[PDB]
Design a protein around this nucleic acid. Structure first.
Length: 153
DNA sequence: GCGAAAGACACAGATTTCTCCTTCGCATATAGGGATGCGAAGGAGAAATCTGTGTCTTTCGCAACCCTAAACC
């Protein structure tokens, strides 16, 4: 809470500078992200943020070895959630096949009791992030098995 | 943010080795005498390599933590 209260002026000053140029800005703990649609406009902000940091909170500085540029032709994610080119949030294909294989192996009764509690939390998180994971699972394995798995333990 | 224990950075100074500077001695191509030129040892005084001192740098397994699942810092 103290850190959030401290970085108020920096947030306020950077917000109205980015708004006037059509750039979206957001900060999470000590991570800062910018995004836009205009070409060749994101190459000017590294000097601006440095001037703001020096002016509004003395002492802080930028780690210059963790700066990233990306577009629609490569992998895109924001703090652990993937953005498909269509414009929808996602968890990733590898995790989807992770869970589909785990549940299929569970249907044969070859899963330890620890992995049931392990997978239940991940399934709940994925359902919250997506909103339609449980429907797809029911449409593939049937409601009887899923309900039995859910009430297990 | 930074324990103990080894290096990097900057600044002196010291020393053995060597290379330039006398000094007179010689010599040999010209019938003895004199002269342009080169060789031999001291005697310097210059220079590259080495060595020594003082200020930082780095980042500990660093009395005093909870025990259900997932993601983030």
């Amino acid at each position: 809470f103290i850190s959030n209260f401290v970085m108020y002026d920096f947030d306020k000053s950077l917000d109205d500078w980015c708004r006037n140029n059509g750039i979206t800005y957001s900060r999470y703990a000590d991570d800062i992200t910018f995004s836009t649609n205009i070409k060749d406009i994101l190459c000017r902000v590294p000097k601006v943020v440095k001037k703001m940091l020096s002016l509004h909170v003395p002492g802080l500085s930028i780690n210059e070895s963790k700066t990233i540029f990306t577009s629609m032709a490569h992998n895109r994610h924001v703090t652990g959630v993937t953005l498909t080119p269509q414009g929808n949030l996602s968890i990733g294909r590898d995790r989807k096949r992770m869970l589909f294989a785990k549940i299929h192996k569970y249907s044969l009764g070859l899963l330890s009791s620890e992995e049931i509690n392990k997978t239940k939390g991940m399934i709940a998180f994925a359902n919250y992030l997506e909103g339609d994971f449980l429907l797809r699972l029911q449409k593939k394995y049937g409601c009887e098995l899923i309900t039995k798995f859910l009430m297990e333990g």
